[PDB]
């Protein structure tokens, strides 16, 4: 905002194509080329969504959504109501995203820091895209994707989940869930680990690095220092997100019929009946 | 039954959720207040009073007592930066970028800035010093692997500012936080480990240029490196990236910054 | 390369000195474990000061026993021939009392039983491991937090296999041991309690679960980028903030228009990471007991398609 210190560091720079023009803090925010190219690319999605809604029913948050063209409706961006609104919500949306992503590189850059967050963000896009424009394009029917709707996108998850039996048994899910879980463990622990230090029992001293590094050693029989855990930070959660996407892009195609039957192979190998 | 209920379909389960959002909504409020301990107090200046504003959901303090003979600190930012900055207006609507009043790096403004910080070496568990020169400590030893000690550090242009002398390590956390550059004039200057690449053939500093090197603010003291100096070296080293390559802007791409 | 701070550039190692003597009865910390080049490439090569003490031993005893039992209870009927144990390791649960005696420890060998004995020890193990965390926190300072944060976890654990079954007046509802099978109990738990995605609590829990991967991917990300001059060292900065903090602060104040700093970043984080279990546990205590066929409840309130 005006964030006291801010004063100094508020100088020109960065900008992939917004040269010198189009880089002025609209209040607390930073309007850069992609900054606008998000807003436009975005808003034209909200309008398109907002209106598209005014032709199907109730002006309600929790009751619309967006279904793609039918199944064997071929592929080819069909009608503007029986699934084309989706393709124009998507190209619009996917774009809006990619923009905000790189926008960060801009702002990040003009402050001396390192192009590192958008990288970690490009994985979220890598995720979305898998179950919207990757898995579908594979088997042609642009329906295999998902409808943007709150209480109705949970339903896809289930209607496709059980299409394969008890998805649990499905691989990726398993190891991918492990990292999602283990993410919390990390932070939870790191979440206390410094507040514990920063704030020790009454009128005592602000327990410093060494203590962090001891406590854990003094409990788990290990501590990875101070840069160490902030490394896992991406890796753990982010690899979860990577691995998660494997969970789907594969199912369609590499293996069709019901799970619970893959893990049946180990159960049979020669020596073992 | 299908969810036992009290007064008008408001079940015991229903009671639970209204209550949850009744106090969590409050949690955000608390940690957000607690979150603005610094900065947020004074973004307004008395050249003229308040009719404009200065946000204030701001909290009631406590004090971080610093272990090392440090003292007591009250973090609610009574901030008065008493240093100078080389900057001035480029239009009257505050969001617009406002230029450096003659080159940054020499006086630090823009992406390459440092900041005042109790001019004394960093806290160790023990009263001892933290960051201490490899050439001065109980057995620390990079074994058979590329310790950059006998190879020339080199920036953008040429390798004619590169007598590497000794690594400069953090004693508790065993990490090499600094490479020492005996600049062509017997001037030892240090560089922030992350911002330099150590190829087993040379040390590449894609960060700065052959020149601009003999400027990293001297650690005016041999062993003890420290904040006013530590935030300063990294600061002026960062001055490469944006303000180094003459080319004041450019679309980018993967491999070493445009190369040559 | 290393211009992006992922794996460490150079390998400095030194005299592994024991560490902290603060109140902690030094008499139990061990000597020195092996150094490790591999783990070293990530963040810290040492084995370190494993402090085998009083109530500690007690835990691992019960835990290794909770384990041994399930092992023996695997084995005991498991067509012994240790040529299959490996094969059918997965499909191999030993479910709690099948028939309903009610919470009656007088449930035998076959017809349940297992659980009572095993479950008894796991009940201690963790609680005694909750033990450590406090005394070991008291031994220098370390507020309490790392212990208080675990309470949240131990809570759903108890709700999922202790409290709730005690409210239905039956352990069968006990999320028993084995691999493949706990994975399966979890499925029809919702498919008898009305498609769970409809429950307000399992829903907020997933939102918060997902929220944590987000916050750590952010904290972590924000740090190695800012790790050019001190971000990496968090506390000293909560006492004397250089540009690691300041610069890391602006980044968000710009992108999204509001940010945290140091103590705040982890005062946010702990909460968002703990709530995952807390909140998630509350809903699992309401299902069954105070609400059959979830969907209905929702249907009275609004939970539409
Ligand atoms: C949360 C909702 C359900 C549930 C749903 C699921 C689903 C769905 C899945 C699991 C999976 C797992 N669950 Mg579960 N699980 C539940 C409750 C539990 C409870 C308990 C209540 O006490 C336990 C102990 C487990 C334990 C486990 C693990 C066995 C396994 C990976 C967890 C993990 O890495 O932890 C976090 C990590 C750590 C503590 C670090 C160490 C990891 C340890 C704990 C386990 C490693 C196991 C394996 C990867 C390696 C064995 C190596 C040997 C050499 C063979 N679940 C509840 C009732 N669980 C997943 C799996 O793949 O299992 C096959 C899976 O797909
Ligand atoms: C494979 C996983 C599935 C999935 C499975 C589930 C399951 C399961 C659940 C949700 C739930 C939610 N999902 Mg989902 N969801 C998926 C993909 C998405 C996408 C997307 C961009 O791809 C979005 C925007 C959402 C959004 C949402 C939320 C609105 C809701 C709680 C979010 C949360 O996780 O907390 C984390 C959130 C944050 C830290 C910030 C908030 C996120 C943003 C701001 C939401 C914007 C809403 C919308 C875009 C506004 C448009 C206009 C209005 C309709 C008028 N989901 C994919 C396809 N989702 C939960 C739910 O419905 O219960 C309440 C739930 O139980
Ligand atoms: C399969 C049928 C259902 C379903 C049924 C359930 C059920 C049933 C439950 C969940 C629960 C959860 N579900 Mg679900 N869930 C479904 C679909 C989903 C989806 C999805 C994307 O589709 C998501 C993201 C989730 C997400 C979640 C989590 C938010 C949540 C808590 C898990 C956790 O973090 O760890 C869980 C935490 C623990 C197990 C903590 C205990 C740890 C202990 C103390 C460790 C002791 C170690 C021991 C002594 C020694 C062994 C280890 C040694 C190292 C060897 N569910 C489907 C529809 N879900 C749980 C809940 O109620 O939350 C709302 C739950 O019980
Ligand atoms: C319910 C029936 C089946 C099942 C079927 C499936 C299916 C089918 C899938 C999953 C998938 C997933 N399951 Mg499952 N799953 C089951 C049970 C489980 C359980 C459990 C404990 O019971 C767990 C923990 C999980 C967990 C998971 C996750 C690991 C994974 C989604 C991760 C992700 O980030 O997506 C990545 C995507 C995102 C995080 C969305 C990001 C969107 C973009 C990039 C950003 C949006 C910004 C927004 C618009 C901004 C608006 C803000 C406002 C302007 C302010 N499942 C069983 C019971 N599961 C998914 C998967 O494979 O991975 C995706 C999936 O497709
Ligand atoms: C706040 C978020 C939630 C949370 C929090 C949490 N967990 C925690 C903590 C916290 C705050 C701790 O402080 C505590 C801890 O100290 O670890 C960090 C812990 C902990 N969380 C654990 C697990 C855990 N937490 C999970 C989840 C979560 N934990 C949530 C996300 C999960 C999931 C959901 O998958 C798991 C699996 C424990 C590892 C640890 C406490 C365990 C304990 O009490 O240990 C006692 C002893 C034993 C279990 C016996 C060990 C068995 C042996 C290793 C087997 C070897 C057998 C062999 C036969 C012997 C030799 C012969 C050989 C031939 C094999
Ligand atoms: C490694 C992947 C993990 C991750 C990381 C991550 N996420 C990130 C970042 C990072 C590092 C950011 O920098 C970025 C951010 O700025 O927020 C922190 C972000 C972000 N993660 C977000 C959400 C999010 N991330 C999730 C997950 C993950 N993010 C993974 C765990 C999840 C879930 C729950 O798993 C969610 C809900 C956003 C808050 C934000 C990036 C998106 C963004 O802010 O764009 C701005 C957009 C607009 C102002 C409007 C543009 C679009 C609209 C006009 C609508 C167009 C149509 C619409 C998209 C249709 C879909 C509707 C849905 C209901 C289906
Ligand atoms: C900034 O500060 C901070 C720190 O720092 C101060 C920190 O730290 C942290 C926090 C820490 C982390 C994020 C790390 C998170 C993880 C943990 C706490 C969990 C640690 C525990 C485990 C990995 C073990 C779990 C239990 C298991 C595996 C039991 C079951 C095992 C088997 C059946 C074995 C099969 C093995 C095989 C194939 C390979 C090995 C085989 C052999 C040697 C041959 C056979 C013989 C044996 C195995 C010997 C007998 C038994 C053994 C060795 C055990 C944070 C947050 C922080 O903010
Ligand atoms: C150490 O460092 C660090 C910090 O600290 C410096 C940090 O924080 C963080 C980050 C972490 C946190 C802050 C903790 C909590 C994080 C989360 C809960 C993540 C989830 C956040 C999202 C869901 C936000 C997503 C994106 C949004 C909201 C974009 C905003 C869009 C609009 C407002 C559209 C409409 C408005 C416009 C275009 C501008 C109009 C404005 C004006 C005319 C002036 C008035 C403006 C306002 C009131 C705006 C709102 C103001 C507020 C809240 C004050 C990290 C990692 C970190 O490492
Ligand atoms: C010895 O064996 C060898 C080594 C040879 C071979 C290998 C054996 C192996 C690998 C065994 C493996 C066992 C495994 C993998 C077990 C896995 C168990 C899992 C995944 C369990 C999952 C969930 C468990 C839950 C939720 C358990 C909950 C338990 C409770 C809540 C306890 C409730 C409290 C009770 C009974 C007591 C209450 C109070 C009093 C005073 C009695
Ligand atoms: Mn941290």
Closest chain B residue to the Cα of A108, Cα to Cα = B111
Rounded Cα–Cα distance for residues C77 and C72 (Å) = 9
The span from the CA of C155 to the CA of C277, in Å, is 8
Ligand 7 nearest atom to the CA of residue A220, by list position = 18
* Domain identity same for C168 and C250: yes
Instruction: Indicate whether C126 and C268 sit together in one domain.
Output: no
Q: Which residues contact B145 (CB under 8 A, 6 or more apart)?
A: C10, C11
Q: Which of C122, C143, C164 is the last residue of a domain?
A: C143
> How far apart are the C-alpha atoms of A68 and A50, rounded to whole Å?
16
3-state secondary structure of B180: strand
- For residue A42, the tally of other CB atoms under 10 A from its CB is 18
Are A180 and A115 in the same domain?
no
Residues of chain A neighbouring B131 (CB-CB closer than 8 A): none
3-state SS track over A70-84: CCCCCCCCCCCCCCH
Q: Is C217 in the pocket of ligand 2 (CB under 6 A)?
A: no
Inter-chain CB proximity A4 and B41 less than 8 Å: yes
- Asked if residue C139 and residue C149 are part of one domain, the reply reads no
Mutation target to probe the A interface, by most A beta carbons within 10 A, among B104, B113, B173 is B173
Instruction: Pick the last residue of a domain from A163, A191, A225.
Output: A163
A211 touches chain B (CB under 8 A): yes
- Atom of ligand 5 minimally distant from the CA of C129: 44
Identify the domain boundary among A163, A183, A206. Answer: A163
Atom of ligand 7 nearest to the CA of A187: 56
Is C301 known to sit in a ligand binding site? no
Q: From the CB of A184, is ligand 5 less than 6 Å away?
A: yes
Experimental determination approach used:
X-ray
Q: Do A85 and A121 fall within a single domain?
A: yes
C154: its two tokens: 């131990």
Pocket of ligand 4 contains residue A244 by CB under 6 Å:
yes
Q: Is residue C160 located within the same domain as residue C285?
A: yes
Is residue B204 helix, strand or coil?
A: strand
Name residues whose C-beta falls within 8 Å of residue C19's C-beta, 6 or more positions apart in sequence.
A210, A213, A214, A217, A218, B125, C29, C49
Contact C137 A196 (CB under 8 A): yes
A121 Cα to the center of ligand 6, angstroms? 8
C-alpha C232 – ligand 1 centre gap (Å): 31
Question: Does A192 touch chain B if contact means CB atoms closer than 8 Å?
Answer: no
Find tokens 């926190």 and name the residue: C137
The verdict on C154 and C292 lying in the same domain is: yes
Instruction: Judge if A135 and A190 occupy the same domain.
Output: no
Same domain, C179 and C115: no
Same domain, C148 and C122: no
Same domain, yes or no: C8 and C45: yes
CB B196 within 8 A of CB B152: no
Beta strand pairing call for B153-154 and B202-204:
parallel
Q: Identify whether A45 is part of a domain.
A: yes
Contact indicator for C290, B13 with CB cutoff of 8 Å: yes
Q: What gap in Å lies between CA C97 and CA C174, rounded to an integer? A: 9
The rounded distance, in Å, linking the Cα atoms of A32 and A110 is 11
Q: How close does chain A come to B219, measured CA to CA in Å?
A: 22
- Name the strand (E) or helix (H) holding B168: strand B163-170
- Residue A24 labeled ligand binder: no
Chains touching B by CB (3 or more pairs below 8 Å): A, C
Name the residue at shortest CA distance from atom 11 of ligand 4: A244
User: Which atom from ligand 4 is nearest to the alpha carbon of C186?
Assistant: 22
Let me know whether C134 and C155 are in one domain: no
**Residue B163: φ, ψ to 5°:** -95, 105
Which residues 6+ apart lie within 8 Å of C57 measured at CB? none
Number of neighbours of residue B246 by Cβ within 10 angstroms: 6
Distance CA B34, CA C179 (A): 43
Same domain, C45 and C127: yes
Which chain C residues contact residue B176 at CB under 8 A? 9-10, 12
Question: Under a CB-based contact definition with an 8 Å cutoff, are residues A107 and A14 in contact?
Answer: yes
Q: For residue B190, give the H/E element and its range.
A: strand B187-192
Residue contact C291–B14, C-beta within 8 A: no
- Whole-angstrom distance, CA of residue A121 vs CA of residue A127: 10
A241 CB less than 6 Å from ligand 4?
A: yes
Q: Which token pair is C23?
A: 């109140």
User: Nearest-CA distance from A141 to chain C in Å?
Assistant: 23
Give bridge partners of residue C288 from the DSSP assignment. Answer: C291
- Co-location of A42 and A147 in the same domain: yes
How buried is residue A198: exposed, middle or buried, by Cβ count under 10 Å (0-12/13-18/19+)? buried
- What domain range is A59 assigned to? 1-163
For residue B192, give the chain C residue with the closest CA: C228
Nearest to C55 by CA among C133, C120, C121: C133
Closest ligand to residue C70's CA: 9
Tell me the three-class secondary structure of B68-118, residue by residue.
Answer: CCCEEECCCCCCCCCCCCCECCCCCCCCCCCCECCCCCCCCCCCCCCCCCC
Pocket test for ligand 2, best of C195, C198, C206 (most atoms within 8 A of CB): C206
- Whole-angstrom distance, CA of residue C305 vs CA of residue C290: 24
- Bridge-based pairing of strands B71-73 and B131-133 is unpaired
Examine the domain organization and report whether A159 and A173 are in the same domain.
no
Q: Using CB atoms and an 8 Å cut-off, which of residues 12-31 of chain A contact chain B?
A: 12-17, 19-20, 23-27
Number of domains in chain A: 2
Domain end residue (candidates: C127, C143, C159):
C143
B27 C-alpha to ligand 4 centroid (Å): 27
The reply to whether A154 falls in a domain is: yes
Is the Cβ–Cβ distance between A144 and A135 less than 8 Å?
yes
Integer Cα distance of B2 and B12 in angstroms: 12
| Shared-domain flag, residues A124 and A221 | no
Q: Are C142 and A215 in contact, with CB atoms under 8 Å apart?
A: yes
- Ligand 5: does its nearest atom lie under 6 Å from the Cβ of C149? yes
For chain A, the chains sharing at least 3 beta-carbon pairs closer than 8 angstroms are: B, C
The answer to whether residues A243 and A180 belong to one domain is yes
Q: Is A221 inside a domain boundary?
A: yes
Q: Which domains are assigned to chain B?
A: 12-116 (4.10.540.10), 117-248 (3.90.50.10)
- Residue whose entry in the numeric block shows the structure tokens 């409840």: C297
CB pairs < 8 Å spanning A and C: 293
Ligand 9 proximity of C123 Cβ (cutoff 6 Å) = yes
Of B190, B170, B195, which is closest to residue B180 (Cα–Cα)? B190
Measure the CA angle with vertex B50, ends B49 and B51; round to 5°. 125
Confirm or deny that A168 is annotated as ligand binding.
no
Measured in residues, chain B has a length of 260
Residues in CB range of B88: below 8 A, 6 or more apart: B98, B99, B101
A230 vs C: CB within 8 A: yes
Atom 42, ligand 6: residue with shortest CA distance: A97
Domain check: are C57 and C88 in the same one?
Answer: yes
The gap from C-alpha A268 to its chain's centroid, in whole angstroms, comes to: 39
Q: How many CB atoms neighbour CB C244 within 10 A?
A: 26
Structural domain including C57 reads 1-143
Resolution (A): 3.0
CATH number (domain holding residue A200): 1.20.85.10
* Residues C172 and C89 placed together within one structural domain of the fold: no
**Closest ligand relative to C43 C-alpha:** 7
Do the Cβ atoms of B176 and C249 come within 8 Å? Answer: no
Whether B107 and chain C come into contact, CB under 8 Å, resolves to no
Residues A147, A216, single domain; the answer is no
Q: Are residues A191 and A106 in the same domain?
A: no
Q: Write down which residue in A147, A163, A179 finishes a domain.
A: A163
Indicate the number of domains in chain C.
Answer: 2
Query: With helix as H, strand as E and coil as C, how does chain A read?
Result: CCCCCHHHHCCCCCCCCCCCCCCECCCCCCECHHHHHHHHHHHHHHHHHHHCCCCCCCCCHHHCCCCCCCCCCCCCCCCCCCCHHHHHHHHHHHHHHHHHHHHHHHHHHCCCCCCCHHHHHHHHHHHHHHHHHHHHHHCCCCCCCCCCCHHHHHHHHHHHHHHHCCHHHCCCHHHHHHHHHHHHHHHHHHHHHCHHHHCCCCCCCCCCHHHHHHHHHCCCCCCCHHHHHHHHHHHHHHHHHHHHHHHHHCCCCCCCCCCCCCCCCCCCCCCCC
Among C121, C143, C165, residue at a domain's last position: C143
Interface of A with C in 70-99 (CB under 8 A): none
Strand order across the B153-154 sheet = B153-154, B202-204, B197-199
Indicate whether A110 and A9 sit together in one domain.
yes
* CATH number of the CATH domain containing C28: 1.20.85.10
Same domain, A235 and A253: yes
In a domain, A268, yes or no: no
d(CA C76, CA A17): 71
Q: How far is C143 from chain B (nearest CA, A)?
A: 14
Give the span between the Cα atoms of A258 and A164, in whole angstroms. Answer: 4
Which among A108, C4, A112, C222 has a CA at the least distance from the CA of B240?
A112
B170 C-alpha to center of ligand 10: Å? 19
With CB atoms and an 8 Å threshold, state whether A3 touches C274.
no
Does A146 lie in the same domain as A96? yes
């Amino acid at each position: 905002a005006l964030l006291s210190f801010e004063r100094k560091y508020r100088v020109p720079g960065g900008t992939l194509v917004g040269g010198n023009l189009f880089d002025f803090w609209v209040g607390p925010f930073y309007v850069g080329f992609f900054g606008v190219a998000t807003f436009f690319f975005a808003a034209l999605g909200i309008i398109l969504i907002a209106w598209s809604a005014v032709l199907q029913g109730t002006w309600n948050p929790q009751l619309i959504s967006v279904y793609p063209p039918a199944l064997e409706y071929g592929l080819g961006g069909a009608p503007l109501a029986k699934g084309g609104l989706w393709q124009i919500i998507t190209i619009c949306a996917t774009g809006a995203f990619v923009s905000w992503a790189l926008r960060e590189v801009e702002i990040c850059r003009k402050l001396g820091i390192g192009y590192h967050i958008p990288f970690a963000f490009a994985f979220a896009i890598l995720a979305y895209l898998t179950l919207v424009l990757f898995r579908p394009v594979m088997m042609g029917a642009w329906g295999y994707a998902f409808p943007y709707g709150i209480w109705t996108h949970l339903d896809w998850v289930s209607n496709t989940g059980y299409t394969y039996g008890n998805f649990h048994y499905n691989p990726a899910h398993m190891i991918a869930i492990s990292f999602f879980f283990t993410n919390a463990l990390a932070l939870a622990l790191h979440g206390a680990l410094v507040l514990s230090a920063a704030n020790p029992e009454k009128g005592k001293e602000m327990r410093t690095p060494d203590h962090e590094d001891t406590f854990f050693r003094d409990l788990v029989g290990y501590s990875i220092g101070t840069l160490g855990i902030h490394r896992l930070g991406l890796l753990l959660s982010l690899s979860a997100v990577f691995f998660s996407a494997l969970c789907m892009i594969i199912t369609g195609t590499i293996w069709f019929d019901q799970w619970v039957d893959w893990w049946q192979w180990w159960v049979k190998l020669p020596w073992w009946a | 039954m299908v969810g036992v209920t009290a007064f008008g379909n408001f079940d015991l389960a229903s009671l639970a959720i209204y209550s949850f959002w009744i106090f969590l909504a409050g949690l955000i409020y608390y940690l957000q207040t607690e979150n603005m301990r610094e900065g947020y107090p004074l973004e307004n200046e008395d050249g003229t009073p308040a009719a404009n504003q200065g946000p204030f959901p701001l909290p009631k303090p406590k004090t971080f007592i610093l272990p090392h003979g440090r003292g007591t600190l009250t973090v609610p930012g009574p901030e008065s930066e008493d240093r100078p900055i080389a900057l001035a207006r480029t239009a009257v609507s505050e969001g617009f970028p406002h230029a450096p009043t003659g080159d940054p790096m020499k006086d630090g403004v823009g992406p390459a800035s440092w900041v005042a910080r109790r001019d004394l070496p960093e806290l160790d568990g023990h009263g001892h010093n933290k960051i201490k020169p490899m050439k001065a400590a109980a057995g620390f030893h990079v074994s058979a692997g590329k310790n950059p000690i006998g190879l020339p550090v080199r920036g953008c242009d040429l390798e004619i500012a590169g007598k590497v002398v000794d690594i400069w390590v953090d004693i508790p956390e065993q990490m090499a936080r600094f490479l020492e550059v005996e600049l062509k004039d017997g001037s030892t200057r240090l560089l922030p480990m992350q911002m330099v690449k150590v190829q087993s053939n040379r040390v590449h500093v894609n960060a700065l240029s052959s020149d601009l090197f003999a400027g990293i603010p001297t650690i005016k003291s041999p062993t003890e490196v420290t904040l006013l100096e530590e935030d300063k070296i990294c600061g002026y080293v960062a001055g490469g990236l944006m303000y180094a390559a003459p080319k004041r802007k450019s679309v980018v791409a993967a491999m070493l910054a445009e190369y040559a | 390369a290393e211009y992006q701070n992922i794996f460490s550039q150079v390998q400095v190692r030194g005299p592994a000195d024991l560490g902290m003597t603060e109140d902690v009865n030094l008499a139990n910390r061990s000597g020195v474990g092996p150094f490790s080049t591999l783990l070293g490439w990530f963040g810290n090569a040492q084995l370190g000061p494993i402090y085998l003490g009083s109530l500690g031993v007690l835990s691992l005893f019960s835990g290794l026993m909770w384990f041994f039992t399930i092992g023996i209870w695997f084995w005991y009927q498991a067509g012994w021939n240790p040529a299959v144990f490996l094969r059918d390791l997965f499909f191999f649960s030993l479910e709690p009392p099948a028939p309903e005696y009610g919470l009656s420890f007088a449930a035998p060998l076959k017809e349940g039983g297992l659980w009572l004995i095993a479950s008894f020890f796991m009940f201690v193990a963790v609680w005694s491991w909750w033990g450590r965390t406090y005394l070991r926190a008291q031994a220098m300072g370390m507020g309490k937090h790392t212990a208080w944060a675990f309470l949240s976890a131990i809570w759903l654990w108890m709700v999922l296999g202790f409290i709730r079954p005690i409210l239905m007046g039956s352990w069968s509802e006990a999320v028993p041991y084995g691999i493949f099978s706990h994975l399966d109990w979890t499925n029809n738990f919702s498919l008898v309690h009305g498609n769970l995605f409809y429950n307000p609590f399992h829903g907020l829990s997933i939102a918060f679960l997902y929220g944590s991967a987000l916050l750590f991917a952010m904290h972590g990300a924000t740090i190695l980028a800012v790790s050019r001059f001190g971000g990496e060292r968090e506390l000293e900065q909560i006492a004397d903030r250089g540009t690691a903090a300041e610069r890391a602060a602006l980044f968000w104040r710009w992108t999204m228009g509001f940010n945290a700093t140091m103590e705040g970043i982890h005062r946010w984080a702990i909460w968002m990471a703990v709530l995952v279990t807390l909140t998630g546990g509350i809903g699992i205590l309401l299902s069954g007991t105070v609400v059959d066929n979830w969907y209905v409840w929702g249907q009275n309130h609004g939970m539409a398609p």
